[PDB]
Amino acid sequence: SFEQTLDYAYLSDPTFKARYDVTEFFASSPMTSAIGVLENQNDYILIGNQAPFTA
Amino acid sequence: SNIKINDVFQRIQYAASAGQTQFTIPFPFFDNEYVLVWQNGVQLVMGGAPGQYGISGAGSPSGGLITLVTPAALNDIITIQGDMPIDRTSIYSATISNLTGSDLNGDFNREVVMMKQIQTTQALLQLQYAPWLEVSQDPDVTKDRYLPLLGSGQVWRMNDSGTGIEAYTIDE
Amino acid sequence: SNIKINDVFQRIQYAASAGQTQFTIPFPFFDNEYVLVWQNGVQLVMGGAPGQYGISGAGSPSGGLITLVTPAALNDIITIQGDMPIDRTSIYSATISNLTGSDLNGDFNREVVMMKQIQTTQALLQLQYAPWLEVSQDPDVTKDRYLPLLGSGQVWRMNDSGTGIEAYTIDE
Amino acid sequence: SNIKINDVFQRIQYAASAGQTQFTIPFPFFDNEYVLVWQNGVQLVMGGAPGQYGISGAGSPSGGLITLVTPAALNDIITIQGDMPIDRTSIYSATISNLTGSDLNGDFNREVVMMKQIQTTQALLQLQYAPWLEVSQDPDVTKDRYLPLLGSGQVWRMNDSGTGIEAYTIDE
Amino acid sequence: SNIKINDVFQRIQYAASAGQTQFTIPFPFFDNEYVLVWQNGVQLVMGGAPGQYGISGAGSPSGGLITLVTPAALNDIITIQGDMPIDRTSIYSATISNLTGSDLNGDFNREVVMMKQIQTTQALLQLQYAPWLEVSQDPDVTKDRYLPLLGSGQVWRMNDSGTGIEAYTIDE
Amino acid sequence: SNIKINDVFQRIQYAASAGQTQFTIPFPFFDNEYVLVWQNGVQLVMGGAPGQYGISGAGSPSGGLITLVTPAALNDIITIQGDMPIDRTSIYSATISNLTGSDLNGDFNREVVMMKQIQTTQALLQLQYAPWLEVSQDPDVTKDRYLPLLGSGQVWRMNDSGTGIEAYTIDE
Amino acid sequence: MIELTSAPTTKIEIISAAISMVGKQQTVNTIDGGGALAIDAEKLYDTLVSAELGSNRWRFAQAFQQISIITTLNPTFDGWLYECQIPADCIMVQYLYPNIQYIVFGDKILTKSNQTFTLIYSRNVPVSKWPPPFSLYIVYHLASMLGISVTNSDRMLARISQGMEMWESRALFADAQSSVTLPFRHNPYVDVR
């Protein structure tokens, strides 16, 4: 089962140096906010949480 | 380090010695395809066959080298000119572009070389009035500047009224 | 401003078909006022009245479209040219804290378009010596380069000494 | 360089009043050495000796001033032109460093001024076909564009076949 | 570093794509000098000159990288092998001193890697009888395992008595 | 305090001079019984009788000395090899073992020497494919690796299908 | 196989060694976040190396190439006839082959003949081509400049100075001693005969 949202979420470029904060879009319901991800080849999604998660 | 631009024209011409194959490219360039080579007014092709040339030094801050496959004859004229497309196809993203000093250096270097190639053509290959001449300071006045197309056996001649340059037939 | 600038001449000319009204602009432009339209050598005015034109596609990387109010006659010559001013009126703060992709792309792109407009004029509308000719590689030598003003009924002619171009009167 | 660059030609010419010493520079410039001054076709030098001039206003948006040491005679022609070498005016570190908007403004303003100087010569001091004329839109067709070198007493004349411009000797 | 040593062969080989420069090192290594690189059977050298390579990832569990200076041609064979000399990498005092788990981890990890390099050569590059074959279980019986030196034009052939392998000249 | 391991093989071979008795053991060893000596392919016995040898230097960090009882003849071949057993019979207790730097040094030294003896056999006495050859990187593919037992008058020959090596009778 | 060198092979390894000499830890993969020491080391590295290789005949930095007559350029003094282009990578002109009359004038080489001329000159070469003594000399010299630019410590400058000058002489000896000393090109009391 799933309840909580990620504490941190970023999009990054192939060099893994850019940081585009998207924590609110991932946390919000689909009808309130959304964001396009993995726009180009070798792009990244960086996600972090205070506690470990397995799904 | 910056590339060699100041007072370095993007064109050079040589008078070869008998048997010479190596000719310096004295100006920076970014890609082998953006360098044009002529020999006695005939444009050459990059390759390994006789009559062709090899090239090195792309991306070098100072220039490179042209190596003819066939050794040149005495007083062959070798012309080398930089000719880069004036465009911009690598751009920054709106969201995930990390600005770097290398990025800024690359973009400014690209535009300075483009601008130098334009000014090289203007300074060495084009005609102009002397800067102190009393030409009309209004560009809309085209009396001394606009030219007509020349038909066969025609020269440019200011008309009898001094209002414009027109084509003028002169027989041979 | 987050667009690419392709390598396209900033001038296009068409021979209209019978009743044609839509003419494509293949080059990028940023503002409708920075495009000049001629029909048979007469500059048109942007508007909705007959004898005028409407324009769309500003800011698009692939250019836009010119729509004549009055359909063109067969073989009417339509000329479209980009004529952006060369200046910079939007600048950054001294200690900017937010530099957006559009602003940085915009500054680089607009200078590329300006240089392309200069180069389009000098490649399609101006005279030049062939790049391989033995012109003096010192720009201070103006023998072949500096022109005098032409009086009524005069042509440009290299003087007898071969030291400079002077105005020569012809009455034939 | 936190100024704005206006769209002003980088050349101005005056006919002097009796005893005039001060002449306005309407275009921006950044260094005193990069502004050329002629008086009746003779270039002047900066200084305080008679026959020289002083200059002020570098870095300003406009409104610079040229002050002749010797007052000009009536109808003396004073020409003021900007001439700044094309070069990079900044250097950015590859490692993480600081960036300011003053750095970006200085780079883009300098490059806009350099482009304006090229375009000022093109618009005011050079020859071109009218934009609406039916020149070949392929630059490889050099019939109307490429010129030959002129020998003594020769003019540019389109040949009888209408295939290119050739040097033509003119007699009585 | 306190890393875990995974069970990975200390050799990897690739067939390069067109223009490929980056190749992954899937096995751990501790020093750049202890990783050998071949390209089409020719050993390369670390550096920045053309024909050389750069390496990163020392001390990491895996995921090192080899970057060729010159992009590889299609189907170039790249071989990467670990070669670390067998040696003590630690020294302990006889008098009462300090000990850390970092010291022990460094010793045991490097000895495991050294053993894996020996076993990688044994498994991938050497010949052996199938483990289930009925070979003599006493190593002093050298009939099947001891080889003689080969002279010119000779092969290894078990003699007619079935007592040992001897060099045999092939009449050809 | 460490022993000589790096780039020091655990095998040496000499060509004796006439009347020589002293032959250096250039590698460390721990026990006299773990050193093997051959003279012209015949293994010698430690002792004092003629045809036997004496040995010294066990436990030395750098090696020892072999002293033949009978002086050697010219160009006799003396081979010395380290052949320590691969085992571990002295271990730490679970309750009353005081860990010492001498204990750790002793244990690592034994395993390093064992490993060097294995690598000496692999490097100097065994066959292998060149590290850059395109052998299968999967050890389960035994085509080039597994060998069959040779019967009388048989050689190893890759079969006609290129799927495995099989014994192949060749008449003498 | 060939043993790989443990001496520095890249300019980043030279820079990071110089940064460690003045006291700071530095890995090659985090050089971009090295702070003021990395800022100055990167800025000063190219200037120092080019000046060093451009001021002395180092054997490993030598090169040669044919030079080219430039058209329409005519000297009008001392009998010189042609102006020749110096190669793009040339950092210090050393001499010309064959032994003919020439001078370096401005950024050109003036000659009196139109035969084929080859220039011997110094050039920048990558670190992997450097002799190890030269690399350590550059590390000391660069660290010395980091002492002035960053540390602002007179004590550090005094400590570095001894090693910098010692390794300059040792690097010069190691480079020079590998080959015979060449004779003079001009020997007037013999040539006149």
Q: Is residue A10 classed as helix, strand or coil in its secondary structure?
A: strand
Cα F92 to the center of its chain, rounded Å = 29
Interchain touch G–B (≥3 Cβ pairs closer than 8 Å): yes
Cα D38 to the center of its chain, rounded Å = 13
What is d(CA G176, CA G191) in angstroms, rounded to the nearest whole number? 28
What is d(CA B53, CA B25) in angstroms, rounded to the nearest whole number? 13
In terms of Cβ atoms closer than 10 Å to its own Cβ (0-12, 13-18, 19+), residue C160 is: exposed
Q: Is residue B165 classed as helix, strand or coil in its secondary structure?
A: strand
CB contact under 8 A, E168 and F146: no
What is d(CA B47, CA B55) in angstroms, rounded to the nearest whole number? 9
Mutate which of G32, G128, G135 to disrupt the E interface (most E C-beta within 10 Å)?
A: G128
What is d(CA E92, CA E77) in angstroms, rounded to the nearest whole number? 44
What is d(CA C82, CA C35) in angstroms, rounded to the nearest whole number? 5
- Helical pair D101-124 and B101-124, crossing angle rounded to 10 deg: 20
Closest-CA residue of chain A to B93 = A13
CB contact under 8 A, D153 and C159: yes
What is d(CA E109, CA G70) in angstroms, rounded to the nearest whole number? 64
What is d(CA C70, CA G165) in angstroms, rounded to the nearest whole number? 85
Cα F74 to the center of its chain, rounded Å = 25
D164: Cα within 13 Å, side-chain hemisphere:
11
Buried/exposed code over F75-84 (b: 16+ C-beta within 10 A; e: otherwise): ebebbbbbeb
Q: What is the number of other CB atoms lying within 10 angstroms of the CB of residue C117?
A: 24
| Non-local CB neighbours of C95 within 8 Å, separated by 6+ positions | D100, D101, D102
Interchain touch G–C (≥3 Cβ pairs closer than 8 Å): yes
Of C86, C124, C130, the CB nearest to D137: C124
- Report chain G residues whose CB lies below 8 A from the CB of E56: 28-29
- Helical pair G11-21 and G35-53, crossing angle rounded to 10 deg: 120
CB G128 within 8 A of CB G156: no
Of E33, E36, E52, the CB nearest to G6: E33
CA distance C131 to chain G (A): 14
Q: Which chains touch F (3 or more CB pairs under 8 A)?
A: E
Name the residue among C67, C107, C81 with its Cα closest to residue C26: C81
- Report chain G residues whose CB lies below 8 A from the CB of E68: none
CB G176 within 8 A of CB G63: no
> ∠ CA B119-B125-B129 to the nearest 5 degrees?
85
Q: What is the number of other CB atoms lying within 10 angstroms of the CB of residue D165?
A: 22
What is d(CA D35, CA D15) in angstroms, rounded to the nearest whole number? 18
Q: Which residue has the tokens 């067939």?
A: E15
Q: Is the peptide bond before G188 cis (omega within 30 degrees of 0)?
A: no
Q: Which chains touch E (3 or more CB pairs under 8 A)?
A: F, G
Name the β-bridge partners of F147: E129
What is d(CA C90, CA D16) in angstroms, rounded to the nearest whole number? 36
CB contact under 8 A, G71 and B23: no
Per the document, the length of chain F is 172
What is d(CA C124, CA C27) in angstroms, rounded to the nearest whole number? 15
What is d(CA D29, CA G192) in angstroms, rounded to the nearest whole number? 61
Torsion angle, alpha carbons of A33, A37, A39, A42, to 10: 160
Looking at residue G43, its amino acid is K
Query: Which helix (H) or strand (E) is E147 found in, with range?
Result: none
Instruction: Extract the runs of DSSP E, i.e. beta strands, from chain E.
Output: 11-15, 22-25, 35-39, 42-43, 53-56, 64-68, 77-82, 128-129, 154-158, 165-169
CB contact under 8 A, F155 and E168: yes
Name the β-bridge partners of D78: D14, D39
Mutate which of C38, C102, C108, C170 to disrupt the B interface (most B C-beta within 10 Å)?
A: C108
- Sign of the Cα pseudo-torsion (B31, B34, B37, B42, in order): positive
The DSSP annotation for F155-172 comes to EEEE-TTSS-EEEEE---
CB contact under 8 A, B65 and G87: yes
Q: Which residue has the tokens 């010192």?
A: C138
- Sign of the Cα pseudo-torsion (F4, F9, F11, F16, in order): negative
What is d(CA C42, CA A2) in angstroms, rounded to the nearest whole number? 71
What is d(CA C112, CA C61) in angstroms, rounded to the nearest whole number? 13
Name the residue among G52, G30, G34, G51 with its Cα closest to residue G42: G34
Q: Which chains touch A (3 or more CB pairs under 8 A)?
A: B
What is d(CA E154, CA C143) in angstroms, rounded to the nearest whole number? 83
The pair of structure tokens assigned to G63 is 């090169």
What is d(CA E30, CA E60) in angstroms, rounded to the nearest whole number? 8
Cα F7 to the center of its chain, rounded Å = 14
List Cα–Cα distances, C23 to B116, C8, C46, C65, in angstroms: 34, 16, 14, 6
The pair of structure tokens assigned to F22 is 């002293």
The pair of structure tokens assigned to D150 is 């002129």
| Non-local CB neighbours of G86 within 8 Å, separated by 6+ positions | B24, G67, G93, G107, G108, G109, G119, G121
Interchain touch A–E (≥3 Cβ pairs closer than 8 Å): no
CA distance B85 to chain C (A): 6
* Gap sites in chain B (C to N > 2.5 Å), preceding residue numbers: none
- Report chain B residues whose CB lies below 8 A from the CB of A13: 93, 96-98
* Helix, strand, coil tally for chain G in percent (to 5): 45, 15, 40
CB B170 within 8 A of CB B156: no
Mutate which of B90, B92, B96, B102 to disrupt the A interface (most A C-beta within 10 Å)?
A: B96
Interchain touch D–B (≥3 Cβ pairs closer than 8 Å): yes
Name the residue among F105, G185, D164, G67 with its Cα closest to residue B150: D164
Backbone angles phi, psi at D159, to 5 degrees: -75, 165
Q: Which residues of E touch G (CB under 8 A)?
A: 31-36, 43, 45-49, 52, 54, 56, 83
Query: Which helix (H) or strand (E) is B76 found in, with range?
Result: none
Of F105, F131, F152, the CB nearest to E161: F152
Of E13, E123, E156, the CB nearest to F155: E156
Backbone angles phi, psi at B139, to 5 degrees: -65, -20
What is d(CA C66, CA F102) in angstroms, rounded to the nearest whole number? 91
Name the residue among E108, E84, E34 with its Cα closest to residue E64: E34
CB E39 within 8 A of CB E23: no
Of E92, E115, E122, the CB nearest to F105: E92
Q: Is residue D21 classed as helix, strand or coil in its secondary structure?
A: coil
What is d(CA B159, CA B165) in angstroms, rounded to the nearest whole number? 6
In terms of Cβ atoms closer than 10 Å to its own Cβ (0-12, 13-18, 19+), residue E114 is: buried
List Cα–Cα distances, C139 to B7, B125, C161, E43, G72, in angstroms: 11, 10, 20, 52, 11
Q: Which alpha helices (DSSP H) does chain E contain, by range?
A: 101-125
Q: Which residue has the tokens 């032409």?
A: C150
> ∠ CA C50-C54-C56 to the nearest 5 degrees?
170
What is d(CA G20, CA G13) in angstroms, rounded to the nearest whole number? 10
Mutate which of B17, B67, B78 to disrupt the G interface (most G C-beta within 10 Å)?
A: B17
Closest-CA residue of chain B to A17 = B98
CB G29 within 8 A of CB G98: no
The pair of structure tokens assigned to F90 is 């002295």
Name the residue among F59, F134, F143 with its Cα closest to residue F102: F59
| Non-local CB neighbours of D94 within 8 Å, separated by 6+ positions | B100, B101, B102, G32, G42
> ∠ CA D54-D56-D60 to the nearest 5 degrees?
160
- Report chain C residues whose CB lies below 8 A from the CB of D129: 125-126
Name the β-bridge partners of G104: G109
In terms of Cβ atoms closer than 10 Å to its own Cβ (0-12, 13-18, 19+), residue G91 is: buried
- Report chain F residues whose CB lies below 8 A from the CB of E33: none
Name the β-bridge partners of E13: E79
- What number of C-beta contacts closer than 8 Å exist between A and B? 20
Query: Which helix (H) or strand (E) is D155 found in, with range?
Result: strand D154-158
CB contact under 8 A, C134 and G71: yes
F40: Cα within 13 Å, side-chain hemisphere:
7
What is d(CA B139, CA B158) in angstroms, rounded to the nearest whole number? 18
